[PDB]
């Protein structure tokens, strides 16, 4: 009849590599957060008053705010070093360019990761945000409009860290 | 009501600032606060009738005089640059009544004033791509390079501010964060239909309000006095 | 005593409700006022409660007064555009010729997009920088901050004519706009 | 690989 | 705010239904989920699984907690039930359309809430439950959801394909078509 949620996040945060790590954790029910932990702040801190019994009573526990301050190391730290690395960080994977036309499209798709730099020298062209296929590859569309026998295009030169050289497709 | 003067102020470490607050509601009570963006308004003096001051949250720095029930001034003997902030003059009928805010008045304290410089005002006219899918024109102004942070932007239509399809940046940017005391950047959209943006007799300005020196204050450097001004640039419609 | 106002920041979808919540320490407290600053200007009172009621609802406001938990709530429902601001709470007693006001909470009501369409475009130079445009993006679409130096990325922003923007310019003669916006 | 654990809420 | 983001114990659940998950995200994507029902884990690429090691019963742990946080909110908000949402799909291939050969279909489903959903992939209003896969549950900054589902295809005169969403938040379900060709 009626519906009620609760959701749990666990939240790890990295710039330049595990140089600064910074964990933050949210119990949050119906879209509301009400108590979060925050390793700038270093202990639980109520978001909405909902969240004022959790932390005030988790604060008071030295045991939980020395497991979840332990957490940055022993969970942020630890996945990025071993399993991130092993694994998400290595991944790369090559794109794949095709020019069509129907307004010429070029499509760069199935690549990873994020960073790439796709262009044509000619301006006036219009490009999607980056499309996150949820299968560990992205893809982007970049569409010029094109008129009749305006010479050969040039290229679609596409730029990413997978490749060495870029690929510059000619039309 | 109430009224505070002056509006904006920029000075160096060490001035004499003199903050001014006339209220004409017969309130006995007027208040000096300071607004951060570090969010909150902290308190720092106050008074409760003519010939009395009291010392609010943060007195430290600053000291009020309150001559006459109309008028509360709050004076920095040696102006810091932690006293850079949004400072706002209230004033009430009784403690536990409304409070009558002024305007709020914008702060620049600097520690060297010859690091002071306009804003460089540049309008950019719409993208192709986005006039021939959108069938709408978004113009972009860029206020660059601009010390310290006090700016005001605005847009101008045919002689007329215009404020439906504008949007500027709430706050303007560091242009080297890692820096300190670094120049500003300002970025600010207006859009309009792709029709409006065809039509050459629609006449679109970005202007660009600078506060920085004022008239009693001398420059005498190798450029040009970055006094206080208006900076604006801008641009034609267009039917190709 | 002091009063703590514990949303600091409230992000709300638009037509959905929002409420901000306070506390006081001084039981003697009797006025409890609301002041909603909007963006570049200074606070207003919009609403107050004192000590001799519970809920008091005017003017599209509710607010109400819990005077044994020493708590009290401003209640904003079907919330519009135009309830973005910071919301300040306070609390007053006899014995104190000031208010003791909350830290604010910023309001954030998100307009809908009936139909987003994202996409980047390039402007005209019109004679020194490259300046892209990243536009129609849907609410939840969070524009990242560039971490590529020289090269400057603007917050979102939304303007009603209601379409979401983001500019991002640079000076660098490799910069180009397919992926400049790296979200 | 390393998870963040669930704190029980306060019970009353 | 930092060049990576990992999202280690997320966990999910609701009352009425008796349902959660547990899944663990990095920048993004899924790295796995939990499938309650078999216990085991199910990691989104193969390749990963091989290499990292979670045992299942960590994500069942934080689920039997938030199951009884649940029961312990619900009564700490005077029982605010949850808010249904309206979802927006949208239809896009994996790779570039090319007549007559094999691509994937993908709608995306965006701010799912509660993550109750029902996604359908019909071919010219015709049940296809062959070569159709779904992410799980994935999460938003907002504590909404959005969910991905797949379809193989090949493009060929105008099959007419929609992508069919059943919501509670929805009265009458969304249907998004794509063709080409
Ligand atoms: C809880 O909700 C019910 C129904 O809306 C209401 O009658 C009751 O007063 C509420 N209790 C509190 C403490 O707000
Ligand atoms: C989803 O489909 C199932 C059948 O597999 C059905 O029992 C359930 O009621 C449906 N839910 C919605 C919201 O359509």
């Keep these: 009849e009626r519906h009620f949620v609760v959701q749990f996040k666990g939240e790890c945060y990295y710039t330049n590599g595990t140089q600064r790590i910074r964990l933050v954790t949210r119990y949050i029910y119906n879209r509301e957060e009400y108590v979060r932990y925050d390793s700038d702040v270093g202990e639980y801190r109520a978001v909405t008053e909902l969240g004022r019994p959790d932390a005030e009573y988790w604060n008071s526990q030295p045991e939980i705010l020395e497991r979840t301050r332990a957490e940055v190391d022993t969970a942020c730290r630890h996945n990025y070093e071993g399993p991130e690395t092993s694994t998400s960080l290595r991944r790369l994977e090559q794109p794949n360019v095709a020019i069509s036309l129907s307004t010429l499209v070029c499509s760069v798709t199935d690549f990873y990761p994020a960073k790439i730099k796709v262009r044509w020298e000619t301006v006036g062209v219009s490009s999607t945000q980056l499309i996150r296929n949820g299968d560990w590859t992205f893809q982007v569309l970049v569409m010029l409009e094109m008129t009749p026998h305006q010479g050969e295009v040039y290229t679609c030169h596409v730029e990413h860290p997978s490749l060495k050289s870029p690929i510059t497709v000619e039309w | 009501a109430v009224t505070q003067s002056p509006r904006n102020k920029v000075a160096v470490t060490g001035g004499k600032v003199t903050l001014s607050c006339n209220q004409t509601n017969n309130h006995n009570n007027m208040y000096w606060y300071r607004q951060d963006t570090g969010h909150g308004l902290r308190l720092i003096h106050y008074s409760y009738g003519a010939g009395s001051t009291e010392k609010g949250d943060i007195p430290d720095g600053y000291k009020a005089s309150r001559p006459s029930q109309e008028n509360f001034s709050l004076i920095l003997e040696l102006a810091t640059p932690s006293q850079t902030s949004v400072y706002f003059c209230a004033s009430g009928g009784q403690s536990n009544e409304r409070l009558f805010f002024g305007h709020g008045t914008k702060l620049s304290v600097l520690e060297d004033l010859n690091k002071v410089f306009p804003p460089e005002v540049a309008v950019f006219e719409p993208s192709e791509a986005e006039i021939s899918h959108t069938q709408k024109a978004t113009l972009v102004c860029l206020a660059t390079g601009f010390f310290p942070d006090h700016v005001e932007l605005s847009w101008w239509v045919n002689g007329k501010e215009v404020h439906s399809g504008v949007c500027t940046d709430p706050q303007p940017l560091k242009e080297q964060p890692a820096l300190n005391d670094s120049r500003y950047a300002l970025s600010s959209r207006l859009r309009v239909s792709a029709t409006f943006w065809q039509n050459p007799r629609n006449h679109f300005r970005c202007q660009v309000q600078f506060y920085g020196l004022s008239e009693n204050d001398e420059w005498t450097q190798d450029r040009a006095k970055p006094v206080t001004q208006i900076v604006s640039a801008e641009a034609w419609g267009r039917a190709d | 005593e002091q009063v703590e106002q514990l949303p600091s920041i409230l992000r709300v979808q638009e037509g959905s409700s929002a409420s901000i919540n306070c506390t006081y320490e001084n039981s003697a407290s009797n006025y409890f006022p609301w002041y909603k600053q909007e963006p570049g200007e200074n606070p207003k009172l919009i609403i107050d409660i004192r000590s001799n009621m519970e809920r008091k609802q005017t003017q599209g406001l509710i607010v109400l007064l819990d005077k044994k938990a020493k708590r009290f709530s401003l209640h904003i429902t079907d919330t519009q555009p135009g309830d973005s601001a910071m919301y300040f709470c306070a609390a007053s007693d006899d014995n104190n010729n000031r208010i003791f006001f909350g830290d604010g909470t910023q309001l954030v009501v998100k307009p809908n997009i009936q139909n987003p369409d994202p996409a980047v475009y390039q402007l005209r130079d019109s004679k020194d920088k490259s300046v892209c445009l990243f536009t129609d993006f849907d609410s939840q679409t969070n524009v990242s901050q560039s971490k590529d130096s020289d090269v400057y990325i603007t917050d979102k922003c939304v303007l009603d004519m209601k379409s979401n923007s983001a500019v991002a310019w640079s000076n660098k003669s490799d910069f180009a706009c397919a992926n400049a916006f790296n979200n | ?12 | 705010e930092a060049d990576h983001v990992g999202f280690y114990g997320t966990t999910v659940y609701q009352s009425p239904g008796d349902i959660g998950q547990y899944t663990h995200e990095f920048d993004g994507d899924e790295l796995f989920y939990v499938d309650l029902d078999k216990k085991k884990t199910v990691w989104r690429l193969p390749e990963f699984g091989q290499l990292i090691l979670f045992e299942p019963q960590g994500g069942l742990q934080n689920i039997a907690a938030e199951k009884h946080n649940l029961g312990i909110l619900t009564k700490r908000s005077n029982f605010t039930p949850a808010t249904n949402e309206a979802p927006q799909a949208t239809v896009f291939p994996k790779s570039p359309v090319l007549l007559g050969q094999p691509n994937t279909l993908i709608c995306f489903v965006d701010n799912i809430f509660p993550p109750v959903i029902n996604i359908t992939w019909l071919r010219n209003s015709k049940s296809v439950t062959d070569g159709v896969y779904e992410t799980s549950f994935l999460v938003n900054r907002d504590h909404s959801f959005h969910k991905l589902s797949y379809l193989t295809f090949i493009p060929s005169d105008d099959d007419i394909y929609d992508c069919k969403v059943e919501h509670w938040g929805l009265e009458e379900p969304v249907l998004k078509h794509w063709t080409s060709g």
């Design chain 4, 1 to 12: 690989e390393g998870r963040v654990r669930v704190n029980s809420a306060y019970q009353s």
